[PDB]
Amino acid sequence: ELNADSIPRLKINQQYAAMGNSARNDADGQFIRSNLQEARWLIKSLESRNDTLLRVSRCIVEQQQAFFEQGEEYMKPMVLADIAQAVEMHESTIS
Amino acid sequence: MKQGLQLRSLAMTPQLQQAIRLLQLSTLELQQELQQALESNPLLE
Amino acid sequence: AEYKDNLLGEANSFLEVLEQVSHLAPLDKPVLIIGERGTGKELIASRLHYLSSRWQGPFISLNCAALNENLLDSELFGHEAGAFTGAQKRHPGRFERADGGTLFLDELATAPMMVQEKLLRVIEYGELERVGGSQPLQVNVRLVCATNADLPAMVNEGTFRADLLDRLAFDVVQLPPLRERESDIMLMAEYFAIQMCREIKLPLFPGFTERARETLLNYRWPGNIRELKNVVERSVYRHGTSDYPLDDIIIDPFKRR
Amino acid sequence: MAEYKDNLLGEANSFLEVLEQVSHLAPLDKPVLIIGERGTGKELIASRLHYLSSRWQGPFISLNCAALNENLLDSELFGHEAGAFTGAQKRHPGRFERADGGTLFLDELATAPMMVQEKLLRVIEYGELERVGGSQPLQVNVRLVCATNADLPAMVNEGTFRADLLDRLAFDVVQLPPLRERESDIMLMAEYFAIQMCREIKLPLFPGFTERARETLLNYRWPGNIRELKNVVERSVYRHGTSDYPLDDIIIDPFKRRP
Amino acid sequence: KDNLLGEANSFLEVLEQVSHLAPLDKPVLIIGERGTGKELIASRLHYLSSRWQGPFISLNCAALNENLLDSELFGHEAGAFTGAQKRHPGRFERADGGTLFLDELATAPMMVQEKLLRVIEYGELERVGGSQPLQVNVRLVCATNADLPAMVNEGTFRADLLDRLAFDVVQLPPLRERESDIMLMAEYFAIQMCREIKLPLFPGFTERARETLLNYRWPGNIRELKNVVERSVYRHGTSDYPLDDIIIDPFKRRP
Amino acid sequence: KDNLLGEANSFLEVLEQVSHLAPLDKPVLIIGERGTGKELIASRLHYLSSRWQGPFISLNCAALNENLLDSELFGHEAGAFTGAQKRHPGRFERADGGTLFLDELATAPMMVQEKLLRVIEYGELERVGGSQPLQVNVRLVCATNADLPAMVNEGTFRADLLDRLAFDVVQLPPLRERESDIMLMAEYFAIQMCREIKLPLFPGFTERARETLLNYRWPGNIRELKNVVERSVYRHGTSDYPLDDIIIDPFKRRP
Amino acid sequence: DNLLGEANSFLEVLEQVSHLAPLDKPVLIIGERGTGKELIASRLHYLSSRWQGPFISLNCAALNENLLDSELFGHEAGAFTGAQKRHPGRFERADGGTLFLDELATAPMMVQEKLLRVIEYGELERVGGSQPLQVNVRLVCATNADLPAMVNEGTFRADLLDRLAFDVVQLPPLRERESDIMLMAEYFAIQMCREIKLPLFPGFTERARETLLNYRWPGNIRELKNVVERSVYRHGTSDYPLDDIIIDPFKRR
Amino acid sequence: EYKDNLLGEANSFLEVLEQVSHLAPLDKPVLIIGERGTGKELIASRLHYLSSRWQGPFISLNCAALNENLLDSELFGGRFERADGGTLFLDELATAPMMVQEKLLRVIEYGELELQVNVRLVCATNADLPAMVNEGTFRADLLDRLAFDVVQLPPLRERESDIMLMAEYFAIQMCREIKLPLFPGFTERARETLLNYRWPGNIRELKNVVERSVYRHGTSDYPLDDIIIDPFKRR
């Protein structure tokens, strides 16, 4: 289970989102739209990091359940390319 | 099978690349970076 | 270690074959078979893979028939990048599938002779023949086969070159015919009755009449196991059949009205 | 220099002399061709020459002739990539192009298309480079190796093999001593494979050889020279038995149904 | 632009034909067996042509990719389903008055034949998705191992090719026909060989077997001549290695 | 108008037929031996035809690769096709308002005919991703040395379509059948080569060479005429001695 | 609304054709070799409710690549932006009117399989445009020289053809009627003479026509057209009546 | 319910209907045997109409065949998404691409790349699948996993007695649509012709023949004795 409390949440200021379309000034709207695009890119980046982490973690916990259960003595040879092939994990974003 | 015509995308670099590079960082590394970034944006919470 | 699943192999020769397999299990060489039809051979191949109990997956399972274009089984030794059109990254596959493993050769006789030559060329030295410019790469994995095809016959035909044919000569298995096996057949018949009663979780195994088993014996039974599995569900298809024993076994799917 | 033959499964009869001739022929890089039967040491001879790939930098290039399927085989000759085919990728040069200077081991399949062999022969005769495009051929030397597995001048008469390709090929042949010919270390290499088999089995000790078994070994038609001998060796080894009996039954024909 | 002249009066007349043709850019054929060296003579014409500083480089007819035949003489400009690049023209487009010896013409596709039949048309180079064709003068030359009339009776090449046949295809004399400097050719070839053989000289030498070789099939004028020369030399490799009992039979079972 | 080789009565009849046909924008075809050079007549006609100025098309048949007319004739100037996109020049698109001589359409895929049929009959086509087909004002022309009379009889043409491809074909006589302008063609060739070889003067041919032409069955006619010209060029020898032995069968090996 | 030949049986067939013409049920249109009676459908569509409705026609021989998005439903979504730059697919172009097909007997029968579905209410959904269709755009097809024995020959799906039409479209033999022969003959002669800017029609020999009346009519109306043109050019003179009939430009002298 | 269209008075049609009704309650995948056009998917229509999950969107709709990357986008979005929860169709099963067929079968249970939605898949085929397996044109594993319980259809030759009723029904519907005053009447010649009418197709054949026949008849006053049939051809 992903540490959702340790997972930050990116919130967009909806008051600014409602205070830009009414802006009869184009510069304010353009700056707001650029800020929104950047913030959306950042939030999507964090979310993609979290989701890829969760998928690869499921793959590893499946691989390292013996390492999880019996322990480091029963720690199987685990590699990223093998894990990526096994769980269809990212080929380079994961790396 | 053979060769003729047919067949047919791309990713992004720099800005998308910087956003992706931010994620390879540590957890609290991402948290402090998020705090510093949110220090600027007037349209985020 | 890991235990192979139960198989109704009550034939005394079948037990002997199992024993031969058992001796071969520590060994690691080619494993061929007479490929009896309707007869569950690669199940035994799995019992082998299971007998090896190798870490990771060495029990590859792919035939030849779907490799209709030569390219498909050609891509059992896949493509790396950009040979023809790269529809996806690292078209390689099915080769590392038994990375440290073994290969199950099904529908092997249908394979192209050029394809066969490529396979054999892979056999000994192990070189990775990846389509597209690159360097080869071996891997410590094995292979095994099972086919109704008559190897001496094909040698007369020369369908595959003789070099490969001998290169495969390391373990043979002539599965008994479906018409050959009778007592094990009824044994597995009751076994499948029970197994269906379990998997469907129907309240009652109906049973079968003595006439039911006898008539099933009078059935063509072309596949001792494959036909039996279809017959199992064919009787399981009937509704209320589980409550009382019935001899209603659906041979022909096209049979109607 | 000289590298130890990782295998010297050789015949004192004349494969000693054959190996000697090979060693004499080895230093140059001129046309290199051999000859032999189904499974008759010919890969092993390939290894012989690859060790005879003199000095260092012996780039072993294998030309599995009956491979390459149908279509892109043409590229496998010359070189793919650029934007040429249904794809685009970096310059994966043809297999001959991929190896510059390397050892060109011919698989003695005898390609069905004479023109395809001729196209390889034209590149084989010389390389002028493909500055126009990677679709073409380039400026590469290579050591080259051929062998025979069938009747050459017959096919010349049979029209199976082009005379011009044949004339360039076989500048100096290398025939092989068949199982029906070599027959030299039969018992010797026999026990050689036996010891290899015991060590593989981690076996206790060699039970021995039966006089009946040795008589059969002499009587063997040996349809395959090198491997089929080793094949039956493995056959008996797997057949195995008590250490009490040196050898039991015949492993020459495993195909035969088990008693 | 020369080699180990076969030193023949026929060779003299053939060279005369070449020299007479030298300025001309007319398309040219040849029917030469392996070891003829007609290709070498052809390229000798190419360098010695009026376009001495001309771009003269062949391309085996057998070469072309199954579908790239248009991409063979012409070269990719735009589209073509590549989706990128494909802006490079053809080596034949790269010719422009230069030479590309049409070797291997004995086997090109009838499809290839007709596409070239278009190339036989004066100028007008069309590329994929093109705007305006290119009338690009280029010097044409070819050689074959077989008989053009033989193919014609077979209909093997379309008579369009016979139209494409333009300059009088000089032909190399047969080995039995050539028979010009066999000892001398052996001498030069063996000089080169001993250079490669790195042995000092042929102390054996001798010439009775030279006349015996005068009684030889010699299927390749240079393909077999020097081939057998080296075969025998390497089997010898000794200083005192004479023309006696040296055989050309690499396929044959020696003792 | 244009340099026309020949003044035969049948040739004159053909010329008058061209004069009559000139208004007929209706497409038709011409039947001639390879090397006929009828295309030249077609071009002279088209210039003299209603397109006193228009487009002009050569259009080698064997010139397309699994690529439609919107990749062959129409062009994909309307881009947005599969794969990348751009502005793509188109032949039948470019041709509209001009001269469209189809080249040796005998060798043509059944698919090619499949497209061209509707391309011609209505004269409206559409392209790579277009709304409307419009129509072309070009002149639809063609010829092939084959006798389609057997081709579509073999089925090798859609005889319905090929007939619809034709309005009233014209076929030039054979020169061997014509058998007349031998002297004039010879003289023109002599002067032309004397210029080309930069020669001083034409030696002339003995009446023996005239009779050789009289026997020169000449399977190439104008093609064979130029072939004989080539023969003379190699047989240049001396201008003082008149050309004695002209007939050069290059397929016959000399000596 | 056009110029063409007519016969009593031809008139009856045209009458039945008009009777079907307002009706929206598609029928199978089979024509003589030298018929190209597509104009009949053109009248029918005018005689159909599509008198002001759509009238898109395409010949099923002219494709592009293994599959054409424009053939049924496509746009500029190959990769990258994925934009319905021209969502308008074939039926989207032809919606609500005449969807006329030519070159029918001559495409990949897989396309026929594909056609069968679009034939049944389209429901074509492209990346450019997704729509359930079932839009009653007038369906009709032509180039019907083929035979149901081609299904016996296995040319295409007999089921596709069987579901294709519920009613017929015939074509009386041109060699059969030969009634308006001189009539349409003079008609085409005048049309060309105007096109030829010719002075006038000099007439023709009745013997010439009667000899010309001997013909298998292999090219039917097309044969008539080409024959008239050739005979006119051979006449090349409006002075004397055209006593000559150009039997075949496949000829020599 | 849904209008007694093709209400098969052949008691065999009723029995097929009863089996289908039992399967209608079942949410397990299912298929039916018949010929298309010889009654293309009419039972599929009934099953969607007899949808117990009546609000369940039986979008279904799988007779045809799409493109390659089209199968890519459909399986990995339409497919289960196209008919979420609801009923899943399949026809021209002989027309599937091998990659496409593998994708479908894997979705039915599970795949091997390194799940699905909805319930009650429904299918039918127009050709003898066992011969195709003998030809080896698909995965027999898919064949079995599909072959839990089927719904055959009566042949047109088998569909014999109720044929007069079906013809009359088609006549009623047609005259309603055709604006004809009335079905002009049954004639012995027409009935005998229909008896001879082999009608390789069942529904499409009879319907198209009747359409041609009525269009020919055009007289609600005048019954048609022996109207011939052809929906195409020249003269």
Ligand SMILES: Nc1ncnc2c1ncn2[C@@H]1O[C@H](COP(=O)(O)OP(=O)(O)O)[C@@H](O)[C@H]1O
């Ligand atoms: N012990 C078993 N348990 C479950 N299934 C079995 C067993 N033995 C055989 N089968 C089934 O029989 C089918 C065909 O068996 P087999 O005859 O070995 O195939 P082949 O026809 O290739 O020889 C297989 O699909 C397999 O599922």
Ligand SMILES: Nc1ncnc2c1ncn2[C@@H]1O[C@H](COP(=O)(O)OP(=O)(O)O)[C@@H](O)[C@H]1O
């Ligand atoms: N001393 C040896 N060392 C290794 N392999 C040997 C030896 N002697 C025989 N063999 C085996 O015998 C065979 C030699 O024949 P090979 O070259 O493979 O056949 P072919 O001539 O058809 O190419 C191989 O299987 C090889 O492994």
Ligand SMILES: Nc1ncnc2c1ncn2[C@@H]1O[C@H](COP(=O)(O)OP(=O)(O)O)[C@@H](O)[C@H]1O
């Ligand atoms: N005059 C010459 N001097 C030296 N070598 C020659 C001469 N003519 C031909 N050769 C040899 O012939 C070989 C080329 O073969 P070639 O005769 O061109 O085959 P083909 O005529 O069938 O194309 C070259 O290796 C070259 O050494």
Ligand SMILES: Nc1ncnc2c1ncn2[C@@H]1O[C@H](COP(=O)(O)OP(=O)(O)O)[C@@H](O)[C@H]1O
């Ligand atoms: N009317 C003509 N007068 C003189 N020479 C002609 C004439 N027509 C063609 N030729 C000659 O014949 C050849 C033309 O061949 P080509 O145009 O390829 O004929 P084809 O119609 O068969 O394509 C050239 O050598 C040309 O000089």
Ligand SMILES: Nc1ncnc2c1ncn2[C@@H]1O[C@H](COP(=O)(O)OP(=O)(O)O)[C@@H](O)[C@H]1O
């Ligand atoms: N009854 C008729 N009388 C005269 N011309 C006709 C008649 N019916 C059709 N035509 C015309 O005859 C021509 C037939 O040739 P074409 O259009 O190529 O036929 P198709 O479309 O069958 O290939 C067309 O112009 C067509 O409109």
Ligand SMILES: [Mg+2]
């Ligand atoms: Mg099997």
Ligand SMILES: [Mg+2]
């Ligand atoms: Mg050569």
Ligand SMILES: [Mg+2]
């Ligand atoms: Mg037409």
